[PDB]
Amino acid sequence: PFFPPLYLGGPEITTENCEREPIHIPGSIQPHGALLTADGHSGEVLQMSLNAATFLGQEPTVLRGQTLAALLPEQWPALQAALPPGCPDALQYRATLDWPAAGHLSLTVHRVGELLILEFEPTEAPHALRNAMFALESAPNLRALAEVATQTVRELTGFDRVMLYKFAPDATGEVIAEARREGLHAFLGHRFPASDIPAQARALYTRHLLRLTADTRAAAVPLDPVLNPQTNAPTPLGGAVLRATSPMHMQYLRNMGVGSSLSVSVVVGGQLWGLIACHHQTPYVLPPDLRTTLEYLGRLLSLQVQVKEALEH
Amino acid sequence: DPLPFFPPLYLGGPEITTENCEREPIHIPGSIQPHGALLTADGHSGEVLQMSLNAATFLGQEPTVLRGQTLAALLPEQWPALQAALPPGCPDALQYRATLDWPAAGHLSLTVHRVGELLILEFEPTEPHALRNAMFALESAPNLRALAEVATQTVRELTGFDRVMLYKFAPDATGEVIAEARREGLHAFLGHRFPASDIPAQARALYTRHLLRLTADTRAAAVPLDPVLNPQTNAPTPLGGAVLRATSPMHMQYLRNMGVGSSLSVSVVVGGQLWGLIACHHQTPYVLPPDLRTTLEYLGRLLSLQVQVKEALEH
Numbered sequence A: 001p002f003f004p005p006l007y008l009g010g011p012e013i014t015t016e017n018c019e020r021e022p023i024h025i026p027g028s029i030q031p032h033g034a035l036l037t038a039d040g041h042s043g044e045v046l047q048m049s050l051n052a053a054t055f056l057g058q059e060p061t062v063l064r065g066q067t068l069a070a071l072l073p074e075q076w077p078a079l080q081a082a083l084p085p086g087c088p089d090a091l092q093y094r095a096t097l098d099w100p101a102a103g104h105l106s107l108t109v110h111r112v113g114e115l116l117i118l119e120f121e122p123t124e125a126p127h128a129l130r131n132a133m134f135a136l137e138s139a140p141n142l143r144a145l146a147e148v149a150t151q152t153v154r155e156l157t158g159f160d161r162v163m164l165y166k167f168a169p170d171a172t173g174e175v176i177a178e179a180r181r182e183g184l185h186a187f188l189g190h191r192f193p194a195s196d197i198p199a200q201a202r203a204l205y206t207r208h209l210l211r212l213t214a215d216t217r218a219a220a221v222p223l224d225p226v227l228n229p230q231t232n233a234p235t236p237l238g239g240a241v242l243r244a245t246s247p248m249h250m251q252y253l254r255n256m257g258v259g260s261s262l263s264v265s266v267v268v269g270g271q272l273w274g275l276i277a278c279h280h281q282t283p284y285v286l287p288p289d290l291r292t293t294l295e296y297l298g299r300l301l302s303l304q305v306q307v308k309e310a311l312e313h
Numbered sequence B: 001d002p003l004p005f006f007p008p009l010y011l012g013g014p015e016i017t018t019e020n021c022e023r024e025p026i027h028i029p030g031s032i033q034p035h036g037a038l039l040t041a042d043g044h045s046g047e048v049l050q051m052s053l054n055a056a057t058f059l060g061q062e063p064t065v066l067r068g069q070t071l072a073a074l075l076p077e078q079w080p081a082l083q084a085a086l087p088p089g090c091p092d093a094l095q096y097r098a099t100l101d102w103p104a105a106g107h108l109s110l111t112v113h114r115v116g117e118l119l120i121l122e123f124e125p126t127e128p129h130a131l132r133n134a135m136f137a138l139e140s141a142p143n144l145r146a147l148a149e150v151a152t153q154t155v156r157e158l159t160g161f162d163r164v165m166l167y168k169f170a171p172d173a174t175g176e177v178i179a180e181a182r183r184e185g186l187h188a189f190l191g192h193r194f195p196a197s198d199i200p201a202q203a204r205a206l207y208t209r210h211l212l213r214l215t216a217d218t219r220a221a222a223v224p225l226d227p228v229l230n231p232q233t234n235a236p237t238p239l240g241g242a243v244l245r246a247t248s249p250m251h252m253q254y255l256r257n258m259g260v261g262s263s264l265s266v267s268v269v270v271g272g273q274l275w276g277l278i279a280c281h282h283q284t285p286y287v288l289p290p291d292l293r294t295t296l297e298y299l300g301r302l303l304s305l306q307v308q309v310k311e312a313l314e315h
């Protein structure tokens, strides 16, 4: 099972109880964006991130009463249709708001039971994706496919180090390709134990396919209230990209000298086959539209991995 | 009975009838559709060899000036990028795309691929979260039918086509419409089946390799390449990879009988075989710009993956 989270007086995590940390319910978010939760029917804002005032430019209490209908007039009917009751928590709807306080915000929404989870992040506003897609497809074998994928992602993102990390049958890991800035250690061909990505994280990653930590030294921002009013229980934030990262993981990134990190799932036959893995030596918020490109690439790689593995077997 | 290609018409090949269908050489028509222009160039020197007859009017230069310059001089910013992206020996399926600002012609989309020692250059005029939203909706579709319906409706919304269908292949190459989204007033084709000679065998071979093809005007006359044969080989120029390549006169007559002015389609390739087609009809001529066509290419790949996934959930 899982331990209770800290804020419900659960035990603090060690290297003895890795598999029992409730990574999906930390009740907080990374501070480069803002999150609201809201009732599926009324559009009533139930929780907000204590930083919401910044991004939204709204007097704190104003929000926690108001309705999405009021708050987002053009958007609220779209949400209603895009995310019908009973849909999966994996389904997401996005829009760009030209919002008074902040030039442009990206809005990402999904639904968990009766709750809508809304994420706001700064945003903005060519052929590299089309060119990459054809390059992946003409790679003659799995090895070359791995090389093209990591190089392509590095070129699109500027990440110092981009790896393709593959999963063995006992969840043991291997770096099979890597493109990196001059003057980093080379991790190509190294293997890592099966606890370095624990059992509960490998399930979330079969389902939600992108996650990132934009700054491995930044403090999480609590949800207020922390518990969902509807349930008097923790909000599942597993589908949220601004979800706060486990403190056990941020400690590991700093021991490596990493300031920013991102990864995309490669899912084949309903199982987690590998990850496109990205390091950055300093903090780095990749904007939503560039993340989308890596989400597409994740699907394309999932297709090509199967194609390529079939022409060996 | 499978039979090897006839020589094309311009090399004295016989004209094509319901009797000799499977033997037309569709990949070497020696002409293109008139809404874009095409050049061929030597893959090492960049010497310009062939051009479509309409090239002067897209590129704003006399044919003889064009032919007198290398791509290094014509495309100084793109020539080195081309050479890196399309190395000798690469497959004919690999494409490189760029946008050019051309003086006379506005923004042109440039699409390049390599066939042996020949570079093929296609030029066409070019012009929010709909794709991302569609990707997630496709993945959340509960079964094959719902996937097919979401896919057809999405493509129709993105493109404005009169009719968008998911065409599915049977083992005998007979086909069937398993879903469609159509303009009000059109007669449904949902659930109709059609014989195996409605897409002959040399065309199914080609659609496993090149994944998107189109006819913007089913009454427009093709534009010849000049000269018609590749001067490197004194042989036909393979335009299998070229989306601007002219369409077989056989197939353009069928569309006119159907009252279609414009057609487009994307392959769904599963396990190395042609699983089906995302097919779009329009009653009048209709050019879909290159960047919108890219969205359909991406959806073709997504749908190939999701079809595998939905079918595996089915035994």
Ligand SMILES: *C/C=C1/C(=C/c2[nH]c(/C=C3[NH+]=C(/C=C4\NC(=O)C(C=C)=C4C)C(C)=C\3CCC(=O)O)c(CCC(=O)O)c2C)NC(=O)[C@H]1C
Residues within 6 Å of the ligand: A014, A015, A016, A017, A018, A019, A021, A023, A173, A187, A192, A195, A196, A197, A198, A201, A211, A212, A213, A244, A245, A246, A248, A249, A252, A261, A262, A263, A277
């Ligand atoms: C006792 C618990 C420990 C633990 C927990 C933990 N780890 C993750 C996630 C990841 N761990 C990864 C491991 C590696 N990263 C690398 O760069 C390399 C090799 C060069 C390895 C072997 C990776 C890649 C992830 C993915 C996450 C990401 O994209 O940033 C979590 C999950 C956190 C979450 O927010 O869901 C947890 C709880 N890691 C340990 O090493 C032990 C001590």
Ligand SMILES: *C/C=C1/C(=C/c2[nH]c(/C=C3[NH+]=C(/C=C4\NC(=O)C(C=C)=C4C)C(C)=C\3CCC(=O)O)c(CCC(=O)O)c2C)NC(=O)[C@H]1C
Residues within 6 Å of the ligand: B017, B018, B019, B020, B021, B022, B024, B026, B175, B177, B189, B194, B197, B198, B199, B200, B203, B246, B247, B248, B250, B251, B254, B263, B264, B265, B277, B279
């Ligand atoms: C003896 C020659 C014939 C012939 C030739 C032919 N057909 C194609 C390609 C296609 N034919 C299609 C047939 C259909 N169109 C529809 O709308 C429906 C049903 C709703 C069917 C069954 C289709 C879909 C294609 C693919 C391309 C497209 O969608 O437009 C070719 C290939 C052309 C080329 O690659 O240049 C050829 C030569 N078809 C016949 O029926 C006989 C008379």
